[PDB]
Design a protein around this ligand. Structure first.
Ligand code: OLC
Ligand code: OLC
Ligand code: OLC
Ligand code: OLC
Ligand code: OLC
Ligand code: OLC
Ligand code: OLC
Ligand code: OLC
Ligand code: OLC
Ligand code: OLA
Ligand code: OLA
Ligand code: OLA
Ligand code: OLA
Ligand code: OLA
Ligand code: OLA
Ligand code: OLA
Ligand code: OLA
Ligand code: OLA
Ligand code: LFA
Ligand code: LFA
Ligand code: LFA
Ligand code: LFA
Ligand code: LFA
Ligand code: LFA
Ligand code: LFA
Ligand code: LFA
Ligand code: LFA
Ligand code: LFA
Ligand code: LFA
Lengths: 225, 225, 225
């Protein structure tokens, strides 16, 4: 079960990479070329890292607990680019953009330590810290990020509402899967945990990538002379 | 002894993080929001890494020698932000800013290898190399950095004198502690070495952070219309 | 044989570092100071990493196969700066510059996994992936990169022709050495493989660095008023 869902992730990310790369090659406009290129690399990074996991790499048995630590490499590299999708679209200021990237990096870093710690009490402490880092990004996204975006695009508040709603709902699912998996309560087996993360990853990457392109199109139409 | 001083570092860095974060949230002005945000992340990174050390993590017994290798992660991430405090305040040029960040990264990288090498002869070679990297940053700071700062703020030469004096004196203490600790002569025990680095870290981070804010205030008063 | 060629690399890189550093210290002009500084750090990074290899570090016996994994650290840090030599000279756009840096990072990252994988079938898969990442950079260099450079310097198409010819020919030699060495067919012994990489590294770093300076001089003469 786990093995097929890793290959489904390879396929899904590779397809996202091809279609974003084609969009990048045929962009009209530097802004469009940038946005296609960000999403190309989100999906291209995830393709290679899903390929390593599918081939059996990036995994260690830590005190009896199978642990796919390479998952946190993918997340550390791709989540900042998703943040950049948002801040590129919202024309976010430099301090708020840096704060989002830093709090996000803090979340993935502490989530990684939460995962590879042999002492699961210590790991669960790091889980809580990582949740507070996520909550920091929630605060920044629904306050300073949102208000700048709505000031920059007064006619497209609904666009950023949908982007933020999809981002917040999807990203909140990751710490739930983490608690269900063998990092937490072990309420679901490894095949199910892997299926969950594969579906989340394809949705938060390919799915969010296509939503970012559709948002760009709406913003540019609302901004034509 | 070592254990309490790691917790003192957690407390000190967390307090610095809270007060710099509060300053960031209430900044008037993008320049002030940037400077508060740099110092927030300096202290927030150090808080998490001090928490890992306090919990017993980030440590390895290398050929019989207890070695807190995670100390070099904290330093690799936080020292460039301290460099940025300086170059942000001095409005340093891009080549000099990159040279300071690169020489600094070289220093921490070679200091890390100097520390984890089992062969302490090789480690001591890397210590010397790291000292020359530090000396490179000294040269850049008291020449090109200082002269640009004084050209940018002709009325505030004393401000950069104090910043540079505190930076140079404090940062020179780290290679002295390193020679005293079990990386070198082992003239002081691990509790004392840990106390020294905790006091240095709180001073060079929280202390220097507050000095950078006070300097900003002096520069802005000297620069009001 | 391997040992002397590692020391030859130390010497060659150190000499390149000194002469690029002297150029940086005596630059007239921010553009010249930037270009000297990029090449200084290319060679300074390679000096330190060649010193680690010469001292016997950065090497692991992976399932019976001696593997100098630190070679990929040098490459991950220095190859983006060589890309920057090119994009600095060509005044390349942000999306094309990011795509070159990302595809290049992808190449070195997958080349590293291709090297440290114990399963050499999996390693050879990663070799192919890394070759396609290289081919991606070839496509970007001879299409978008070249066309922007020739649009920016209509009178100096030959300058970018020589830069690209040297870059493409030299960099193609690395995957050939990799196939000849103990990562592939093991057709040459470790001393010969090390000699090959040392000569390639000195040429692609010091040699290309001096070519980038000579190109800058030609571009500036073709651009004087
Ligand atoms: C613990 C979380 C650490 C990561 C940072 C969370 C807090 C944050 O980002 O604070 C923003 C504020 O504006 C100050 O920079
Ligand atoms: C294992 C997991 C299996 C899971 C199967 C899910 C099948 C679909 C169900 C609900 C999906 C709803 C997605 C709707 C997105 C709507 C959107 O983009 O935004 C609307 C919103 O109101 C903006 O504020
Ligand atoms: C803020 C976040 C709160 C998370 C609340 C839960 C954090 C603690 C998780 C505990 C856990 O995973 O417990 C495993 C269980 O004991 C089986 O062995
Ligand atoms: C050995 C130290 C290596 C790190 C760099 C030290 C020398 C340096 O920074 O030189 C500046 C100069 O302007 C050229 O770039
Ligand atoms: C374990 C270690 C224990 C250590 C206990 C230290 C107690 C205080 C002693 C001296 C501190 C002096 C700090 C003075 C800073 C002054 C300053 O900010 O700058 C002045 C300077 O003249 C600008 O050029
Ligand atoms: C320039 C820097 C010079 C540092 C001078 C000292 C560098 C060498 C340190 C030697 C050392 O630590 O020696 C340990 C001692 O032999 C106990 O075993
Ligand atoms: C596999 C190689 C992955 C690295 C990226 C290669 C493809 C590439 O760079 O595509 C450029 C295009 O413009 C879209 O961004
Ligand atoms: C182990 C390996 C030993 C290897 C010994 C090599 C000795 C020299 C042979 C050929 C070198 C030729 C280099 C010519 C570079 C020319 C150049 O810079 O560009 C010209 C080109 O036509 C622009 O398009
Ligand atoms: C595109 C790149 C093609 C590389 C073609 C070759 C890629 C495969 C290399 C195979 C290899 O190294 O084989 C070792 C040999 O079997 C001794 O044990
Ligand atoms: C792989 C992605 C990692 C992202 C790390 C993000 C780190 C964020 C740190 C924030 C502090 C810097 C705030 C802005 C500094 C601006 C400096 C300047 O303007 O000179
Ligand atoms: C975590 C922090 C690490 C800091 C690393 C710093 C590396 C410094 C390297 C210097 C070489 C680059 C010099 C300036 C390049 C400008 C490029 C351009 O203008 O296109
Ligand atoms: C050590 C060097 C590593 C280099 C990594 C390069 C990663 C390349 C990734 C490309 C995606 C980003 C494309 C441009 C984003 C611009 C963002 C913006 O303008 O706000
Ligand atoms: C493209 C390659 C896809 C390979 C799919 C293999 C699936 C094997 C399995 O899990 O049963
Ligand atoms: C970053 C890379 C970390 C690689 C190793 C992480 C998992 C360690 C597992 C173990 O120690 O058993
Ligand atoms: C905030 C948490 C602080 C915890 C302090 C524990 C100190 C324990 C000790 O070292 O004796
Ligand atoms: C960067 C991370 C390096 C992590 C490991 C460093 C210490 C190694 C200690 C040992 O090998 O015993
Ligand atoms: C500068 C130091 C150079 C040291 C050269 C040592 C070569 C030793 C050898 O390989 O025989
Ligand atoms: C990045 C750093 C990776 C360091 C280790 C790479 C080689 C591992 C060799 C081994 O596991 O035997
Ligand atoms: C429509 C123009 C022709 C297509 C140009 C781009 C084709 C390649 C796109 C990138 C694919 C990379 C996949 C990595 C996984
Ligand atoms: C802004 C960038 C943030 C990067 C990371 C921030 C701090 C993370 C704190 C946790 C680090 C713990 C390291 C533990 C190492 C040993 C694990 C076993
Ligand atoms: C096996 C018992 C524990 C189950 C794991 C609970 C994980 C968190 C559930 C959150 C519910 C949605 C919000
Ligand atoms: C566009 C695609 C977005 C993702 C949809 C869900 C994918 C699930 C894959 C099994
Ligand atoms: C004065 C306005 C209210 C305070 C806003 C900011 C409060 C939180 C500051 C950040 C704390 C993070 C600590 C990490 C350790
Ligand atoms: C400008 C960025 C500088 C980054 C690092 C520069 C070069 C450091 C040289 C020392 C590297 C040694 C690596 C040894 C690995 C094995 C240790 C045991
Ligand atoms: C502001 C505080 C600066 C640091 C002072 C020294 C802290 C020592 C802690 C034990
Ligand atoms: C001509 C002016 C005097 C020389 C200034 C620069 C001298 C040092 C150059 C850097 C050397 C670093 C070598 C690292 C290996
Ligand atoms: C744009 C930046 C690219 C960074 C890397 C891209 C993806 C690399 C894909 C390969 C990663 C494999 C990791 C395997 C870990 C275990 C090895 C044994
Ligand atoms: C021992 C038999 C295999 C030799 C290795 C072949 C490596 C590739 C040669 C490429 C030729 C130039 C293009
Ligand atoms: C300028 C020097 C460029 C490199 C030439 C070849 C060096 C070979 C060293 C053995």
């Amino acid at each position: 079960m786990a093995q097929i869902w890793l290959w489904i992730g390879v396929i899904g990310m590779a397809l996202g990479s091809i279609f974003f790369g084609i969009g990048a090659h045929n962009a009209k406009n530097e802004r469009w070329k940038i946005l296609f290129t960000i999403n190309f690399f989100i999906c291209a990074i995830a393709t290679g890292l899903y390929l390593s996991m599918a081939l059996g790499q990036g995994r260690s048995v830590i005190a009896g607990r199978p642990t796919v630590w390479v998952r946190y490499i993918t997340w550390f590299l791709s989540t900042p680019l998703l943040i950049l999708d948002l801040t590129f679209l919202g024309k976010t200021s430099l301090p708020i953009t840096a704060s989002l990237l830093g709090a996000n990096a803090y979340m993935i870093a502490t989530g990684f330590v939460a995962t590879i710690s042999a002492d699961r009490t210590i790991g669960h402490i790091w889980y809580v810290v990582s949740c507070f880092a996520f909550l920091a990004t929630v605060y920044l996204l629904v306050n300073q990020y949102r208000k700048q975006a709505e000031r920059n695009y007064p006619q497209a508040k609904k666009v950023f509402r949908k982007l933020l709603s999809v981002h917040l709902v999807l990203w909140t699912l990751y710490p739930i899967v983490w608690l269900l998996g063998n990092t937490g309560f072990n309420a679901v087996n490894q095949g199910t945990e892997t299926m969950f993360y594969t579906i989340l990853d394809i949705t938060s990457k390919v799915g969010f990538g296509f939503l970012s392109l559709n948002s760009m199109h709406t913003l540019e139409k609302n901004t034509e002379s």
